[PDB]
Amino acid sequence: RIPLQIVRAETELSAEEKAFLNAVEKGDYATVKQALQEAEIYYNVNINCMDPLGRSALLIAIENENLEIMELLLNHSVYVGDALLYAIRKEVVGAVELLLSYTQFSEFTPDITPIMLAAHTNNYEIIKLLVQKRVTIPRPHQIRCNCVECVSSSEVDSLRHSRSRLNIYKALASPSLIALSSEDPILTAFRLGWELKELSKVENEFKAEYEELSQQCKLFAKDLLDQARSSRELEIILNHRDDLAKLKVAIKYHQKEFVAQPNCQQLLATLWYDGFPGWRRKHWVVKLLTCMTIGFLFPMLSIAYLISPRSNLGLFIKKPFIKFICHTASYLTFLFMLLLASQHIVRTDLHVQGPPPTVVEWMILPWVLGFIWGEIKEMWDGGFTEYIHDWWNLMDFAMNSLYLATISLKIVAYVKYNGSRPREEWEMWHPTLIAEALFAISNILSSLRLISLFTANSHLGPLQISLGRMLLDILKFLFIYCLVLLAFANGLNQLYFYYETRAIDEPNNCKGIRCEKQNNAFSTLFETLQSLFWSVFGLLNLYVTNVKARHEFTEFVGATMFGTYNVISLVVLLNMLIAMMNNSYQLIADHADIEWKFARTKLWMSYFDEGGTLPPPFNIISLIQNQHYQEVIRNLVKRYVAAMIRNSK
Amino acid sequence: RIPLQIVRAETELSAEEKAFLNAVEKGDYATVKQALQEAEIYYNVNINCMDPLGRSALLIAIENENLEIMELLLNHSVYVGDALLYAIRKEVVGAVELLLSYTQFSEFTPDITPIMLAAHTNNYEIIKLLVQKRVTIPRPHQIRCNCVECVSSSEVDSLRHSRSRLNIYKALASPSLIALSSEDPILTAFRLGWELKELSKVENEFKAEYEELSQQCKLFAKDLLDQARSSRELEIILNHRDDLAKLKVAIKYHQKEFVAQPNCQQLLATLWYDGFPGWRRKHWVVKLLTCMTIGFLFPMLSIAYLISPRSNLGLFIKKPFIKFICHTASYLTFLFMLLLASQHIVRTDLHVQGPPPTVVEWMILPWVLGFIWGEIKEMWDGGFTEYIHDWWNLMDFAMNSLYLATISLKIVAYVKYNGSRPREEWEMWHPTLIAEALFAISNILSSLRLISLFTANSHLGPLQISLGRMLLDILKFLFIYCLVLLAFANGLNQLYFYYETRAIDEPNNCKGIRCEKQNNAFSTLFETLQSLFWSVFGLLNLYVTNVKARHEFTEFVGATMFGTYNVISLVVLLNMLIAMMNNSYQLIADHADIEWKFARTKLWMSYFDEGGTLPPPFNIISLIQNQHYQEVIRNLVKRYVAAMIRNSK
Numbered sequence A, B: 001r002i003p004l005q006i007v008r009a010e011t012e013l014s015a016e017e018k019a020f021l022n023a024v025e026k027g028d029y030a031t032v033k034q035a036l037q038e039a040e041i042y043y044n045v046n047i048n049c050m051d052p053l054g055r056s057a058l059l060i061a062i063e064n065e066n067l068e069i070m071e072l073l074l075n076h077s078v079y080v081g082d083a084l085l086y087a088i089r090k091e092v093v094g095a096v097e098l099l100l101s102y103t104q105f106s107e108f109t110p111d112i113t114p115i116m117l118a119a120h121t122n123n124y125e126i127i128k129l130l131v132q133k134r135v136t137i138p139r140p141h142q143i144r145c146n147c148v149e150c151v152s153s154s155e156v157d158s159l160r161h162s163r164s165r166l167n168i169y170k171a172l173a174s175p176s177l178i179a180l181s182s183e184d185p186i187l188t189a190f191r192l193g194w195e196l197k198e199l200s201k202v203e204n205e206f207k208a209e210y211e212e213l214s215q216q217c218k219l220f221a222k223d224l225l226d227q228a229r230s231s232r233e234l235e236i237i238l239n240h241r242d243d244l245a246k247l248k249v250a251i252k253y254h255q256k257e258f259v260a261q262p263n264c265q266q267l268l269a270t271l272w273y274d275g276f277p278g279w280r281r282k283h284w285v286v287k288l289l290t291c292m293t294i295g296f297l298f299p300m301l302s303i304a305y306l307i308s309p310r311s312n313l314g315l316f317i318k319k320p321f322i323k324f325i326c327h328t329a330s331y332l333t334f335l336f337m338l339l340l341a342s343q344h345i346v347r348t349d350l351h352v353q354g355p356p357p358t359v360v361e362w363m364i365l366p367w368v369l370g371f372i373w374g375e376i377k378e379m380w381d382g383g384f385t386e387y388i389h390d391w392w393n394l395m396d397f398a399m400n401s402l403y404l405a406t407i408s409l410k411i412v413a414y415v416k417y418n419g420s421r422p423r424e425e426w427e428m429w430h431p432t433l434i435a436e437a438l439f440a441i442s443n444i445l446s447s448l449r450l451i452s453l454f455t456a457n458s459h460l461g462p463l464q465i466s467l468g469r470m471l472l473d474i475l476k477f478l479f480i481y482c483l484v485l486l487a488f489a490n491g492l493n494q495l496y497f498y499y500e501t502r503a504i505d506e507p508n509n510c511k512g513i514r515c516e517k518q519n520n521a522f523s524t525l526f527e528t529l530q531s532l533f534w535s536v537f538g539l540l541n542l543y544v545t546n547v548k549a550r551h552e553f554t555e556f557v558g559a560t561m562f563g564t565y566n567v568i569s570l571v572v573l574l575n576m577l578i579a580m581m582n583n584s585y586q587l588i589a590d591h592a593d594i595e596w597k598f599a600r601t602k603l604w605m606s607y608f609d610e611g612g613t614l615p616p617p618f619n620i621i622s623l624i625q626n627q628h629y630q631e632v633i634r635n636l637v638k639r640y641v642a643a644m645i646r647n648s649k
C-alpha cells in the first residue's frame, strides 16, 4: 500500500478563525460585523488570518464582489497588502474604486504593480481609473544595454529580471494603455511592436511571449486604422509627420497588416493609377492594349520628360503606373537586345581576339551604364543596410559588377590583342573568353531579375512572394545536404585517387565526367564534388565506379559508397526537403495575401518619388497638421474602445 | 519612468449629471423620474448628457432592455438620434417598437439606416417590423458604372462610397430581407450572389466581404430548396419560368450547392435514367452488360431515330442515358478507327506523294464532318462566350481545325503531286508530311477528349474535376518556370554560340540534341530552349557542355550554368510545385463532391435536349404556374424562417 498523508502541512486556523472566514465567505454582514467588533476588544481573533489557499477575509470578499463586506473590513483596519491586485484581476470597477479610496503567499510576483496588472487585464475602465491618479511604469532599457544596472540585476537574479522586463512590456503593449496615455497611438504601436520583435530575437527564451505582444501591437494599430470612416480621416492618418509619411513609417517597421488594410490599399491604388480613373473597371483586353501602347512609347515619354518636364506629354511619365510601365518596357528592350547579342546579326568574326563592340553591344552599353548609375544612386540615398535587405538589390549589385568586369575585360583584350588568331588556339584564361563568360552570367542574372516584377501582378505576385519565403528553409536544407556531399566526396576521392589516369590515355584526350565516355569521376576532390552533384540529377553513369585494373573489391566499395550517397540524397534528403517545403508552404499560404500586398505596396511606393523617373538608358543623360491628426486619433480611439467593449460582451 | 496621463482628455460630467446617468443605468425609476422632472423647471441638468463611452440615458436604457425607463425618457423629450440603431443592433423587439412609435459620437457610420442595420442583424421580427412601415434601400449602381454620381462620390470620398456600397449589399444579401420583400427569393438569391461574386472580382479590396455575402446568398437559396417536402413542390420550383428552367438559371449563375442538393440530384437522376426504372438497384455486371449492348447497337438506334422518330425503336435514343451511351460508343468507334489508321490494314504505299484516302480515312471523314457540324451548331446556338468557358470545347475547336487542315493539305497534295517519288527525297515542308503530322496531333487531341467523359462516373468524376481545378495553379507555376528557362537559355546560348559547328562535321551528319551523340546543345537559342526542356527530364547528357577547342574555363562556366539551372528547376521549382499542388488539392478535395455533381449535372443537361440527338456520323445526314410557384415559395419561406429560429436558439 501507498500511504497518503499531508506531506507539507500548514498551520490550520482556530474554530473561531474558520468561523470568521466562513462568515465573510457566506456574505452574512451581521456575523462578520459582530466577529470583528468582538476581535477589537480582545486579542481573540486575527483579522488578517489566512485560508489554506492563502486568501484572507478581504480577498474572499473581493472574489465574491461583496462591496459591503469589503467596505466593512476596510473600515475595521484589515491588512490590505496585495488586495488591489486581486481586485484588478477580478476586473470589478467597484472593488478597485473602493480600494483606491481606502510575507504572505501571493498569486502575483513582487514586481507586479497595480497599473501594470491593470494593463495586463486590458480593462479600459480600470486602467482609466488607475491612470487618472498619477501612475508610472518604469522604462525598460534598450535590448543590448551594458549599463551597470542591467548586468547587476541580471547576475543577481536573472529570472526576476526577465520576468520584470516581460511584465513591463506586457503592460506597455496593452491596447487600452495605448489608447490612453499615448500621444500617437499608431506610432507607439508601430515602435512597440518593432521593439518586441527585436526582443523576441534577442531573448531566445520567452520568444513566444514577445512575438505574441508584437502581434498584439500590430493588431491594435490595424484596428485603429479600421475605425476610419472617411477618406479625409484616412489621408490625415497616413500623411502625418511627427507624402504618406505614416505609411512609410509603417513600411519601415514591417507593419504588414496595417499596410495591407483594405482602405489603405484603396488609397494607394488611386495614387498608383493616377492617370487612369477607371482602370479598376476596364476590361482585360483594354488593359493589355493600354499597357502595350504605353510600353512601346517609352522612348517618346522619356524624351518628352527630358526635354520639357512641365508639359502634358512631359509629366505623363511622372504618374506611378505609367512610370512603372515605361521602366518595365525599357528593361524588356534591354533583355531583348541581350538575346540579340547571341543571334548572328552583324556578328563579329569569332577568331578576332579583343574585338570592338558590335552594334548590339554598343546599344547595351547605355543600358548597363544606366543600371550602374541607378544602383549607386539607390544605395547612396537609402544606405547600405536598406539596400542589402532586398535580395533583388543584391542580385542587381552582382549583375552590375559582372557587366563592369565584362567591359573592363573587353577593353583589356582590345588594347592588348591585335591579331586574328584562331579560337581553337586561345589560352584557357584568354580575356575574351572570360569576358564572354561573365557577359553570359550577367545575361542570366538580368533575365532572372524579371521575377521581381511579378509582385505587381495579382495572380503571380502571391506565388512569387511565397516561393521567396520558402527559399530560406530550402537554403538550410541545402546546407545539410552540402555537409553530406562533402562527406561522401571525401570518402570517394580517398578511395579512387590512386587510379587517376592522364587525359592522354583517355579515348578522346578528354579527362573528366564531361566526356562522351565519363572517366576519372573520383580522381580529384573537385571532380568528385562535380560527379556527386551531377549524380543528384542522374547524369553520372555507373561505369565511372570501375577502374582500369579491375580491383573488384575497390570497385564494389566505390559502387556502394556511390549507392549510399544516392539513397541518402535522392531517397532520404530529397523527400525530407519535399516534406519541409509542403509544411512551410502551408504556413506561408496562410499569410500569402498580406505578404504580397506589403511587397506590392513597396513596389508602388518605389515609383511615387520624382527621383529616378527616367529609366535606363535615359537616366544617364505642422501645428495644424498635428491638431487634425489628434482630432482624428481621438475619434479613432473612441470608436475602437466602443468596438472592443462590443466584442468583449 | 514612463509617465501615464490621459492624453486626449474628455470633458467630464457634473456630479449631478453622473448621478442622473448612474440612476438610469441602475434602473431606479423614481430617481430618474425626479431627476428629469427637476431638470424640466431649471437648466440644471442636460438630459442629453454623454458618458465617456458616448452613451446617453436613452442608450443606457436600451442596453439594459429597460422598456419602462425608455418610455419615461421618450416621454420627457430626450434627444433620440441614433437610438433606433442601437435598439436594432441589441435586437430587442420591444425597444424597436417603442422607438418606432416615439454631432455626438456614434458606433454606426452615417450611411447606416434602420432597415439596413436590421438587415445586417438578420433578425426576422425586427426586419418585418421595419418593412411593414414602408422603407426603402437605395439601389446599388452597376459595378462598371461611369455615371456622374458614381465618379463624383468616389473622388469626393472613396472610403465612404465603398463602405456604403458594402453596407447596401450586406442589407440586400440578408436571408430575412429576401424571405420578405422579394417576389422570387430563389432567383433574387441567385442574381444577388452572382453580382456579389462579380463585385468581389472588381473590388480587389473588400474581396473577402463580397465573397462571404455571395456564399451567404448561395446558402440561403440552397436552404430554401432544402425545405421542399414533396416531389411536386420540387418540380414546381425547378420548372418555374419568370423544362428545368430554374435549374438552368442556377447552372448559369454557378449555384453549385443548389444544383448538387440531394433532392435536385435525385430528380435529375430519374430524368437521366428515363428508360431504366431500376438502374439504381441493378448489379455492376448487369449495368456493364446493358451499357455494352446499347453501345454496340448505336448504329441501329441512330438509324431507327433517323428513319422513324415516332416509334418504339426510334425514340429509344431520345432517352438521355441511352443518348449518352450511343454518343460515347460512336466516339469510341471513331477513336478505334483512328488507331486503325496507323495499323497496316490495306495501307497505301508510303512513297506515294498525295495519295488518295484509304478505306480507314474514308470512314473517318464522316466522323470528322459530323464533329465539325456539331461544334458549329453548338457555338451558333450557345454563343462564343459560353463555348469558350469550356476548355473541352476549346480543345474540340483545335481538334476540328487540325482535322480540316489535314483534309485541305491532303487535297492539295493530291491535286499537286502525281508521282511516287521515294519518301527519303521529299522536301521538309512536303504537304503530305505536314498533313500526316497534323493528323497525328488531331489523334492525340481526339483521344484526350475522352477524359471529359469521366464526369459521368462516380469514381473517376471527382478525381478528374479536381485535376482540372489544379491545372490553373499549375499554369501559373509553369509561367514562372518559363521565365527561369528563358533566363538560363539566354545565358547558355550567349556563352556557347561561338562554338557552333556544322552538321557536316558531326559524326552522323546529324546536328542537335536528337542525335546518338548529342551536340550543339546551346549553339542557337531555339536549340538551347529545347536542351534545357529535355534536361528537365534528364534526357540531355552532360558532355554537351564540352566544346571542340576544350576551353576549360568556358566549359566549366557552361557546366555551372547548366547545374544551376538543374538545381533551380528540379530541386527548387519542382518541389515548390509539389507543395503548391498538395495545398491546392487539399482545398479542392474539400469541395470535390459538390464540384463534380455540378459538372455531372451540366453533362446530363447537355443530353436532355432534342437537338443533337444523333451522334456523328449520323448528325450530317404562365399565370397558373406563377401562382403555384408563389404558393410553394410561401411554404418554403415559412419553413425556412421556422428552421432558422430553431437553429438560432
Ligand SMILES: CC(C)CCC[C@@H](C)[C@H]1CC[C@H]2[C@@H]3CC=C4C[C@@H](OC(=O)CCC(=O)O)CC[C@]4(C)[C@H]3CC[C@]12C
Pocket (backbone or CB within 6 Å): A291, A321, A328, A332, A450, A453, A454, A455, A456, A457, A458, B479, B482, B483, B486
Ligand atoms: C514566359 C516567357 C515567354 C518569358 C516572358 C518574359 C516577359 C515577356 C514577361 C515575364 C514576366 C512578365 C511581367 C510580369 C509582371 C507584370 C505585371 C503586369 O501588371 C499586372 O499584372 C496588373 C496590372 C498592374 O501592373 O497594375 C504588367 C506586365 C508585367 C510587367 C509582365 C510583362 C511581361 C513579362 C516581363
Ligand SMILES: CC(C)CCC[C@@H](C)[C@H]1CC[C@H]2[C@@H]3CC=C4C[C@@H](OC(=O)CCC(=O)O)CC[C@]4(C)[C@H]3CC[C@]12C
Pocket (backbone or CB within 6 Å): B291, B321, B328, B332, B450, B453, B454, B455, B456, B457, B458
Ligand atoms: C484505359 C485504357 C485502356 C484506355 C481506355 C479508353 C476507353 C475504352 C475508356 C476510357 C474512359 C472510359 C469511359 C469513362 C467514363 C464512362 C462513364 C461510365 O458511366 C459510369 O461510370 C456510371 C454510369 C452512368 O454513366 O450513368 C460509362 C463508361 C464510360 C463512358 C467509359 C467507357 C470506356 C472509356 C471510354
Ligand SMILES: [Zn+2]
Pocket (backbone or CB within 6 Å): A141, A142, A145, A146, A147, A148, A149, A150
Ligand atoms: Zn541599462
Ligand SMILES: [Zn+2]
Pocket (backbone or CB within 6 Å): B141, B142, B145, B146, B147, B148, B149, B150
Ligand atoms: Zn452610376
